[PDB]
Design a protein around this ligand. Structure first.
Ligand SMILES: *Cc1cc(C*)cc(C*)c1
Lengths: 247, 16
């Protein structure tokens, strides 16, 4: 996250920190995700496409730091890794950039709500906030696009939803963005998501409910003028989410 | 680059 503020997991308790085990036993951060039910985390396929094996991955909930344990965290294995079979990218755009991870602790349990862990509501079919709405993003992504290290404490910021018309202006992204995506950014272009924030939530009030409106997906650079974040538009993926999370 | 890279296909990343 460029700009914004250091926060703690209590303030974004649906946030999932996803890591990969390496040959050697070294563990590195992959991407963010969001807890949408006790057993289910949603993320972005591009995060996993290179190494699509569920056994590689660890999911933490209730965790506020990147490479240190925090009180209230819980650790999970990935029981099912579901990538979108129509995932595709051009030079910049990612289509169907959506993944599901079924989580299970070694003791065979799903998540339990606590002061540090809560699910986030999915929107109803095609139900999105009006453009101009202020939403939140969060993650362990770069604080500056030129940095080589990642912040060790979770960050969040506020960005505003941009109309399709405006985002489909040529000096924005043109026809790179579809009805299956949402653009969001800072009016003054000083705060944004960045590398490392992929798969994490775009969270908006809607129905007076904190709602997973988007998943961090793509953009050109980070915090560049007329170059918003592009998010997978959750309200348009309910059937995919339904046909892949049946109990 | 390496297999230890964070979010290699993310925005601003090598393959974003
Ligand atoms: C160096 C690198 C790393 C990944 C994960 C992907 C690409 C295309 C290049």
């Amino acid at each position: 996250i460029i700009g914004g503020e250091f926060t703690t997991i209590e303030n974004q308790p649906w946030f999932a920190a996803i890591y990969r085990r390496h040959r050697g036993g070294s563990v590195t951060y992959v991407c963010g995700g969001s807890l949408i039910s006790p057993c289910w985390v949603i993320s972005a396929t591009h995060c996993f496409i290179d190494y699509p094996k569920k056994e590689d991955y660890i999911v933490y909930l209730g965790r506020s730091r990147l490479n240190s344990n925090t009180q209230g965290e819980m650790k999970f294995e990935v029981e099912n890794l579901i990538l979108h079979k129509d995932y595709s990218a051009d030079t910049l755009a990612h289509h169907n950039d959506i993944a599901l991870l079924k989580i299970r602790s070694k003791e065979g349990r799903c998540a339990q709500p606590s002061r540090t862990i809560q699910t986030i509501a999915l929107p109803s079919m095609y139900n999105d906030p009006q453009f101009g709405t202020s939403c939140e993003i969060t993650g362990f992504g770069k604080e500056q696009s030129t940095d080589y290290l990642y912040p060790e404490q979770l960050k969040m910021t506020v960005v505003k939803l941009i109309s399709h018309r405006e985002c489909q202006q040529p000096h924005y992204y043109g026809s790179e963005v579809t009805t299956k995506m949402l653009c969001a950014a800072d009016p003054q272009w000083k705060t944004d998501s960045c590398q490392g924030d992929s798969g994490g939530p775009l969270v908006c009030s809607l129905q007076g409910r904190m709602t997973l409106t988007g998943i961090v997906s793509w953009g050109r650079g980070c915090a560049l003028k007329d170059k918003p974040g592009v998010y997978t538009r959750v309200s348009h993926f309910l059937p995919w989410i339904r046909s892949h999370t049946k109990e | 680059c390496s297999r230890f890279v964070v979010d290699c296909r993310g925005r601003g990343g090598p393959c974003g």
